[PDB]
């Protein structure tokens, strides 16, 4: 509505950029507010019903794409390649998990990243293509809200290429981290019954560092038609998580809430099961996906951070044991990947030396399709 | 039409079963003649145009399924798993080949197999020739040829077509070896312009041992709307192949003819290129697929004949070099596969006694999905 904006704008907002010109933002937000939504409420409903099936344990989920999307990579060929990666993993998971697989993308809006510390020589950290320039500088890192406008345009293109231009396939659903508010608040819409929905993406999640119960991001998604998701990390409280679930799934609707566990290969086995049982006890028909990526980030001797593939697979296996054991629906995988033949991730600790070459990520290390294949295989 | 039947029944017919009861056949053929076709002529035309694209080099093909389809495997779950295998390989090929991939199945009619030796090794029962002809069992009664089986095959095929989505996308096209004339002749149909088509399958091929130019099977497919294909083996003559092409692609239509090279890992490199160049010279816009299975069959001390995965991959690589070198369109792969986690094929010579466990194939050894994955990878 506009009610919702008011409510959300009177909460605390984390990881929000300092936009240079207040006027330009007002202009941008106006333009976005008066533009077509990227997705449709009927499709949202469609997906929502599918995720109800996933909560009943009769279907599985593969979510995959870049850490930080490149918004010159909005062209037919390259999105085709990303969709092919999804084909590959979907088929693999179907065979490993013996259930139907829903394809979901980290695409058409992954243009913002949250930062642990805001601040080379004490410069401002890179925030994504929707916020600031890639190269480390003074002026480039200056936040430019026109980038949001460019991001919208690229996202529209990607949606067209994906097949959400007209009504018809076996669809590729769209998801990205709903961290930003100026963009996202401008993308709110109402349906035929005045029920509000987020119009930027089918299936948004909230990042680990913006999931405060009394916070803005939760408030937004709390009152939104879209199926919602939330990242969950090792050092979250039982009581915390319960409150979070009450706000995002008050009616205990199966398919509504999705919790993506990212707590690392070692910690997951000890941390996850108490959380899962409490949510089961609370009566939330939640669906758990594993995020074995962000739990297991590791610094290589040369090159950036990487992740050992063995570690990722370990976590996937442990995740399923934990969730299934404690009585929850273990429903699939959340991975960051790429079609490009990169070496950003390596099989194991021995391989650490060859990280450097073929490393193209704007942010976190991604899995090459075949590495991701290994990760999905662990599911059994 | 019916004149076609006359013509085709005039020619020489190989690998045709000795049906026990003649009258029952007449009844069966009548019933089939008066039953709905499994596929439709508009879909055929759809596919035909797609294969024109494949002949221009703007798309690729994955054909895969069982050597000998099991008739009681006609249920939603199991065909879902087969389609998932196709998802997996299609995605893989798309990534390796950097072009759009067409999914085609060895399904809904692969119920007959051609045999070199009518009998086998106490008894000496006649060899089992597919679930549409003979019992799997090793006695004398089951091996008795029963034409009711054709009727059962039709029924199972109808079910599979429904589950595949042709009852009313990212379509799974259907193919099988056009072999049982009694069945197949009964499945001939006419469209709105009285153009005849084979109504059992979208995309039929003829096996290497029934591809005689002046033979029955060629004659049938010669005058049929469906896109047609033909297996091509090591010892085929230049002149032979040319004549074959003239009969199956008289008007030089791109997308019409498909030649599936199955020659073996060693022989393919030397034998294929002269054939490919001659057809190029003849001006036939043909599309070549590799069949690295049938060229490379090997006996196992422990079990029934297997295939080394390394050999299969070798042939795939060699196939592409040969075809691309000599100026023809190398357009994809033809593989006998299964979703089941079997050991019917082994990586290489090292796996001596592993073939013991998990060997369920009615006929020739199949690839497990992951082994097939390796085979598709060789395309690179
Ligand atoms: Cl059924
Ligand atoms: Co990331
Ligand atoms: Co075979």
Residue numbers in the entry:
A (entry chain A): 1 to 119, 124 to 172, 178 to 389
B (entry chain B): 1 to 121, 124 to 170, 178 to 389
From the primary publication:
Although less than 10% sequence identity exists between the type I and II DAH7PS groupings, all characterised examples of DAH7PSs share a common (β/α)8-barrel fold, a common divalent metal-ion binding site and conservation of almost all of the residues involved with E4P and PEP binding. In comparison, P. aeruginosa expresses two type Iα and two type II DAH7PSs. The type II DAH7PSs are encoded by the ORFs PA1901 (and duplicated as PA4212) and PA2843 (PaeDAH7PSPA1901 and PaeDAH7PSPA2843 respectively).
The crystal structure of PaeDAH7PSPA1901 (phzC) was solved (resolution 2.70 Å, Rfree = 0.280) in complex with the substrate PEP and a Co2+ ion, with attached water molecule, bound at the active site, revealing for the first time the structure of a short-form type II DAH7PS that is involved in secondary (here phenazine) metabolism. PaeDAH7PSPA1901 crystallised in the space group C2221, with two DAH7PS chains present in the asymmetric unit. As with all DAH7PS structures reported to date, PaeDAH7PSPA1901 features a core (β/α)8-barrel fold, with an N-terminal extension to the core catalytic domain consistent with its membership of the type II DAH7PS family. Residues 1–59 form an N-terminal extension to the barrel, providing additional helices α0a, α0b and α0c, with strong structural homology to the equivalent helices in other structurally characterised type II DAH7PSs, in particular PaeDAH7PSPA2843. Unexpectedly, despite the absence of the α2a and α2b helices in PaeDAH7PSPA1901, which are associated with the formation of the minor interface in either PaeDAH7PSPA2843 or MtuDAH7PS, an alternative interaction to deliver a homotetrameric species is observed in PaeDAH7PSPA1901. This alternative minor interface for PaeDAH7PSPA1901 is formed through interaction between chains A and D (or chains B and C) by residues located primarily on loop α3β4 and is distinctive from the minor interface observed for all characterised DAH7PSs (both type I and II). For PaeDAH7PSPA1901, the alternative oligomeric interfaces and subsequent formation of a significantly different quaternary assembly, relative to either PaeDAH7PSPA2843 or MtuDAH7PS, disrupts completely the formation of any aromatic amino acid allosteric binding sites that are comparable with those observed for either PaeDAH7PSPA2843 or MtuDAHPS.
